[PDB]
Each structure stands twice: as structure tokens, then as C-alpha cells.
């Protein structure tokens, strides 16, 4: 039910994460990734990744903190296709 799929932390230190995901078959314009402390009502950061790529590095994180990380395929037909952006939580 998610697009992209298989959002994973590939490698981690206490202040950075390398994330990967599996792109949809349909070409994506670019991706937007948000990340922020789980449970926060605000604070979340955002950045862009080209549509040809399916990894990113998130840096400048705090050790021991549970982050909610979400990847959006910008302009993808989520509503038409009945999909949602993919999200995971990862601590530290």
C-alpha cells in the first residue's frame, strides 16, 4: 500500500543515517524526505532527492532520539492509486 517501498536504514551512527528505498516502476520527478522526533507536533526537517536516486544521508541527528522518517514521491498519484507515502521510525 506504500510508495516507495522497503524504506530502510542501511547504515547508522549515533548522529547520521543512510536510508534506502525501492522506487516505483513509474518514473518519479523527485522525492521529498521529512524527518523529525517521533511525537513532535512540529520541528520536522525536509529535503529533496532527485527522482533517479533511491538513497539519502540524513546527518546532524541527536544520539538516542527516535526519528520518524517519511519518503514522498513528489507528484505521484497517491490518491488515484490508493497508496500512501512510506514511513519508518528509527532510534538514534
Amino acid at each position: 500500500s506504500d510508495v516507495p517501498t522497503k524504506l530502510e536504514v542501511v547504515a547508522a551512527t549515533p548522529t547520521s543515517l543512510l536510508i534506502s528505498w525501492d522506487a516505483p516502476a513509474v518514473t518519479v520527478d523527485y522525492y521529498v524526505i521529512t524527518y523529525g522526533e517521533t511525537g513532535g507536533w512540529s520541528g520536522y526537517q525536509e529535503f529533496e532527492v532527485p527522482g533517479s536516486k533511491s538513497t539519502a544521508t540524513i546527518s546532524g541527528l541527536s544520539p538516542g532520539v527516535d526519528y520518524t522518517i517519511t519518503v514522498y514521491a513528489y507528484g505521484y498519484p497517491y490518491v488515484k492509486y490508493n497508496k500512501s507515502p512510506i514511513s519508518i521510525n528509527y532510534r538514534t
Partner: protein
Amino acid sequence: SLEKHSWYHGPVSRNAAEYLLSSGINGSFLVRESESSPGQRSISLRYEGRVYHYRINTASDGKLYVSSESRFNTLAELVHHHSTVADGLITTLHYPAPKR
């Protein structure tokens, strides 16, 4: 069978909907039912870092609408329409919030 839509989050408060959209981008949204009043639904929508909430109205003839000019037989038709054109909403309904 509403619950089978990615955008339909069931009973959720206004403030909980804002929490569910914290991780969102422009056009992140969800549809919710009242936790106080069964059958009473709203759309919550993120735009430029703020969450906007819209009552789903029911007309005297049963049609559903968020904007008076655009009335629908079903909630799914309403959401599909406003995913393409804002039509009174501050922006379009593009990214269903992940369910938590």
C-alpha cells in the same frame, strides 16, 4: 469499506490530526470521523507548515461537500475531485498521511 482508503483514518480528533500531519508536506492530508459524534467527518490538510481543517457538509438531499459548488454522491468521489483541483480548499489533497 471507507477504512480501505489510504486517506481515511477513522475516528481522530482535530489535534491528533495535526500530530498525524506533523511529518507532512504541502498537500498531506487525511479524512477523519468525529470522536464525539458518529458520522460527522472532516478533512485535515497541511499547507505551508500549517494545518487547515474542513467540515464535510451533508446537503439536504444527502450530497457531500467541502465547497458548496462541488457536491458528491460519495466521500471517495469528493476526495478524488479535490486531489485534482483545490476548489475552495487551500490546496489539493495529494499525500495521504501514514496511519499511526
